[PDB]
Design a protein around this ligand. Structure first.
Ligand SMILES: Cc1cc2nc3c(=O)[nH]c(=O)nc-3n(C[C@H](O)[C@H](O)[C@H](O)COP(=O)(O)OP(=O)(O)OC[C@H]3O[C@@H](n4cnc5c(N)ncnc54)[C@H](O)[C@@H]3O)c2cc1C
Ligand SMILES: Cc1cc2nc3c(=O)[nH]c(=O)nc-3n(C[C@H](O)[C@H](O)[C@H](O)COP(=O)(O)OP(=O)(O)OC[C@H]3O[C@@H](n4cnc5c(N)ncnc54)[C@H](O)[C@@H]3O)c2cc1C
Ligand SMILES: N[C@@H](Cc1c[nH]c2ccccc12)C(=O)O
Ligand SMILES: N[C@@H](Cc1c[nH]c2ccccc12)C(=O)O
Lengths: 614, 614
């Protein structure tokens, strides 16, 4: 049942769509809204998986849960005040769990046919990098990642007009940085990073090292401008304490869905086009719906206000097919289209391979054990992240670890046993790559038969619906690369796999369960994103756009939430959530979230690690 | 003056547009046609330049001509029977001139921070490649280009069903090869080359070597399928005798324009959209024209038949905006759009830097002199081609050279003097790159002020209109790379520059003199190009498409001519030009063109080189 008129119609059940409805329902008393989502699931580019593997250990119908991510995975307590506030208001802070990013130096590196570890790379004044890359002398004997840091310091040094001092560096800093800082008279958003480093005098060998060693070469090789690329590159300092949700980032959209109500969300309902009814001053939304049989249905309805929570490629399709846009004057319709072109589409992929046990610990490799964080490579792999079966004791050990406490031998010995025990429980690896590496996996994933371990139903009885298997060719090649990266002869066959390629499609011959938007977005060269962002709040009267694609904080949910807030302000009077939080609570969401988390971490550690802890 | 009705309306004054009109006028007696071309020039992706530099030598108002290319540059006597026939029928064979591809081993190579020569690369069982790349043992001690050749032989070996024997290997061979040959059960057009080599067991180091060393990494990293990539990679054997026109490839479109008549060609006239008139069974073409003042004008006219000689991106724009397409049923309109998606857009660029004299000869470098052919590099340069001032004696020396004659000391000594004298006359370098390297130059060319040598009008009085200067940033970086590639401290400032980036635009904020289509196209993965090609001849009744993008021979003018021929056959009864030639002349265009050229080469050599020649 689809209503025939609504106060607010919400296109997109991703984060910005779900977030608009919750805030309008609860803070603006608007109850006659509806969300329309083309796919058969809510959450968009957030998509966690919970697999319940048959516990087939020796002394075991017992079940073991592994959380994995097909989309978004991590967040931070600083710089995401809207997201923190959103977590606190939904009471989801008790589920917050560490997301660690290193293995004390044992994370892997594979570059130019050579497998080694992070600790290895540091030896002898970072010698290995000088042996693999034909570096200029000024480029030798330093950690590659510190070259990005130094160049940032140099950009800040020659831009004293730009304040450069707020200890917490949020989206305003990064907007001003890319819009106000210059290099040699040209502001950074007119620069490509590749051009920038080159003009700074770096070798092409050095630039290739950097974009391979950071794992996400889009920052250098795509059309994104240099300013926004730095925002992304300085999002992962050495000392990052990322966090995540125990049951996966989907916890947050599902939690919003409980509060919205399944009855106002209309899945498998694509909004095909939008027209304006001059008579009763209403929008008219043509749609296409698939029921629970597969029986299609074209229909139409009205709405006083429209909210498009949609990324760039979705927004161009509607614009193309919508009379509300086509009947605009030549000048502004062309200007609006050109404005959609101002953020670059960034392809991303994640392929998850699950295993009954993990094979990258010292017991299986004979080498120092790999635990957590990106294993980078110049192979099509890009980066590889390990994921372990959910375990309360392990999360407390991780929680102890993000305190830089000095354990006594008793506690070091218990942390030892915990670090090792996880390799005996099921686990997973995510291959996570961007720009240059996409086409390698693309062609591989679409060729040949799909991968299924035999007696698969014996290994998992309930395979989630958002899981499309990796192709046999994808598993085959991914397995050779793992042997390379982890320097081991032994990489067994996965029990279960999923492949997800966030790269937007314009082909009508693709099932809906395989249509996915561009993984992330970043501002192109020449883009004045301050003008672009404000133009796209309400481009036609009572028609709004918002979401991550044209946001202040591209790449992150906070981008979507801050973009939506502009719509909720301009169209509905609502102040930014973080500001609403602070008036209501008397402290920031930052301080609240840190205090709440320290408490449950304090309790977790004492309960599991060191009964006599600080 | 634009007619209000025509028998045939031709959209696009590129090669396929101009070729349709000439053949319809002359062979089908159709005189009431008109060509409509959005830009202010004919010829499309053919675009030669003739610069007339002030001869400021010591013993000189004398003029020196340099030919250069912003688009297409070379062709072959075998495998391009339509093009040869077209040359013979227009009497352009007397202007055919060698296009040499090597310097006897002195062409440059720059890979991983190391500058060296082709002769150097051969030393010690191709050792240099093993020192620069971490190759598998089976990948060591062989010439990189011979790895592509061997893999081709292997593909042919395991496909004995595929005949694999015609000595002249034309578009049919390459269509059957990519459509009928398989690797491990999957046919090559379902494969990416990158996936293919990997599955064959090659290292990523080796694959990176290959795609850097061949200069056009699109074959490996883009979405083009493996079969069509091989067609391109085996277009440049070691023994290639390419040829070109003395005054540039534009000779051919200009020669067609003389025969069509400027009066039937309507420049600065974009066809915006197309509708069907059910009443008088006519198409209705909305257009936009700019007169000689800049005064725009929107109009409309009719035509009984429409011929779209347009590449993919142009074809999608019309399809989007045209009622003749939108009023098609849901199924076929979506099927037709999906069919447009089946050829991949391949960006290309050419930046030409002209110099008063050439600086890469031994007199200026102290190293073995560079003459002709690609200087490849893993720098954003890609490939660099030298171009010299037009000189009849030099072309005869080149003509002698494509005979593998053994000159006597008298003739070797005269060839010596000729080889060296060209460095004293003006010359040019073309940077010619694809896929991965485009974005480097893109962002550079659009940033900052444009390059002009001071007292430029003193150096060239008549700067052609199709020449947009290289940006100052482009010249600056291109000059550093030249010092790298040519291993010299000394690369002076260019007298004149041009930049051309064949990468299709969808932004309305770009002048017409800067809108250019995708440089070339190649079949994507999954594309059954036999079905696609025949579907796009006449997709609606009396509406035809043709050109290179969805052709049998992508990359080359012959592709455009063979694609058009299908339209001229199905819509107008005309047999393929090469077949028309043969009936009329009693021999192929291949044999005619070889015999005609041998004669004028025979005469050229005797006149300039060795009076007593074979
Ligand atoms: C691989 C990957 C990893 C990431 N990791 C992180 C991370 O660690 N941390 C972080 O903060 N962020 C991360 N992100 C980013 C985060 O996922 C996004 O910023 C955010 O979830 C996107 O929200 P959105 O509402 O802007 O868009 P979307 O999530 O893309 O929502 C758009 C929705 O609209 C629907 N839709 C489209 N067209 C129509 C139509 N015509 N009618 C109806 N519905 C339509 C789509 O199906 C989709 O559900 C990651 C993204 C990717 C791809
Ligand atoms: C860098 C480069 C080098 C090349 N080198 C070679 C080579 O050495 N040898 C070789 O054989 N080939 C070469 N080619 C390929 C060759 O240039 C092309 O195959 C051929 O010239 C293209 O002809 P076409 O008619 O298919 O398309 P185009 O040349 O692209 O013609 C399309 C024309 O239609 C016009 N147009 C577009 N939309 C509209 C509209 N709406 N209304 C009116 N007019 C419109 C465009 O302005 C253009 O003039 C090269 C190409 C490039 C880019
Ligand atoms: N938050 C993202 C990082 C990211 C944002 N935008 C991107 C663009 C390209 C590559 C990575 C990113 C992640 O967890 O991975
Ligand atoms: N004929 C083209 C070669 C070519 C055709 N298609 C291509 C695609 C990519 C790179 C090169 C090509 C040339 O002279 O350069």
């Amino acid at each position: 049942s689809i209503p025939k008129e609504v106060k607010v119609a919400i296109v997109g059940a991703g984060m910005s769509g779900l977030y608009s409805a919750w805030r309008l329902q609860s803070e603006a008393n608007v109850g006659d809204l509806a969300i329309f989502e083309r796919s058969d699931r809510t959450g968009g580019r957030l998509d966690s998986d919970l697999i319940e593997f048959k516990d087939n250990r020796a002394g075991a119908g017992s079940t073991i849960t592994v959380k994995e991510e097909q989309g978004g995975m991590r967040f931070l307590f600083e710089g995401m005040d809207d997201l923190m506030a959103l977590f606190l208001k939904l009471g989801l802070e008790d589920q917050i769990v560490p997301f660690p990013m290193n293995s004390g130096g044992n994370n892997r590196l594979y570059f130019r046919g050579t497998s080694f570890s992070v600790n290895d790379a540091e030896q002898d004044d970072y010698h290995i990098w000088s042996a693999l890359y034909n570096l200029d002398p000024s480029e030798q004997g330093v950690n590659p990642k510190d070259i990005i840091n130094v160049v940032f310091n140099r950009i800040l040094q020659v831009n004293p007009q730009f304040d450069s001092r707020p200890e917490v560096r949020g989206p305003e800093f990064w907007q001003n940085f890319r819009l106000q800082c210059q290099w040699q008279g040209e502001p950074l958003y007119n620069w490509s990073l590749w051009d920038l480093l080159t003009d700074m005098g770096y070798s092409q060998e050095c630039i290739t090292m950097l974009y391979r060693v950071l794992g996400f070469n889009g920052t250098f090789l795509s059309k994104m401008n240099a300013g926004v690329a730095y925002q992304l590159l300085e999002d992962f300092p050495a000392d990052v304490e990322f966090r995540t949700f125990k049951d996966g980032f989907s916890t947050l959209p599902n939690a919003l869905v409980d509060k919205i109500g399944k009855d106002k969300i209309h899945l498998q309902t694509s909004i095909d086009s939008i027209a304006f009814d001059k008579a009763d001053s209403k929008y008219v939304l043509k749609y296409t719906k698939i029921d629970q049989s597969g029986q299609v249905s074209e229909g139409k309805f009205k709405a006083e206000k429209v909210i498009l929570g949609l990324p760039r490629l979705a927004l161009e399709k509607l614009f193309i097919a919508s009379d509300a846009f086509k009947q605009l004057p030549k000048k502004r319709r062309d200007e609006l289209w050109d404005t959609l072109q101002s953020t670059s589409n960034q392809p991303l992929l994640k392929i998850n391979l699950y295993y009954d046990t993990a094979w990258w610990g010292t017991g299986m490799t004979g080498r120092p054990a790999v635990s957590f964080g990106p294993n980078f490579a110049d192979l099509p792999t890009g980066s590889v992240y390990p994921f372990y079966a959910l375990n309360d004791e392990l999360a407390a050990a991780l929680m102890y670890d993000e305190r830089h406490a000095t354990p006594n031998p008793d506690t070091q010995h218990k942390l030892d046993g915990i670090d090792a025990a996880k390799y005996a429980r099921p686990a997973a690896l995510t291959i996570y790559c961007d720009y240059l590496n996409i086409n390698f996996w693309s062609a591989l994933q679409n060729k040949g038969e799909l991968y299924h371990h035999p007696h698969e139903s014996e290994l998992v009885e309930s395979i989630p619906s958002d899981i499309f298997p990796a192709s046999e060719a994808v598993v085959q090649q991914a397995t050779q690369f793992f042997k390379d990266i982890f320097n081991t002869h032994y990489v067994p066959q996965p029990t279960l796999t999923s492949a997800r390629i966030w790269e937007g499609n314009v082909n009508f011959n693709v099932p809906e369960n395989l249509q996915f938007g561009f993984g992330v977005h970043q501002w192109a060269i020449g883009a004045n994103d301050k003008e672009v962002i404000e133009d796209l709040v309400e481009p036609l009267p009572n028609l709004f756009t918002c979401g991550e694609a044209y946001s202040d904080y591209q790449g992150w949910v906070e981008g979507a939430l801050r973009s939506t807030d502009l719509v909720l302000q301009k169209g509905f009077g609502l102040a930014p959530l973080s500001e609403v939080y602070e008036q209501d609570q008397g402290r920031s969401s930052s301080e609240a979230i840190q205090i709440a988390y320290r408490k449950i971490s304090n309790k977790m550690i004492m309960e599991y690690i060191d009964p006599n802890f600080s």
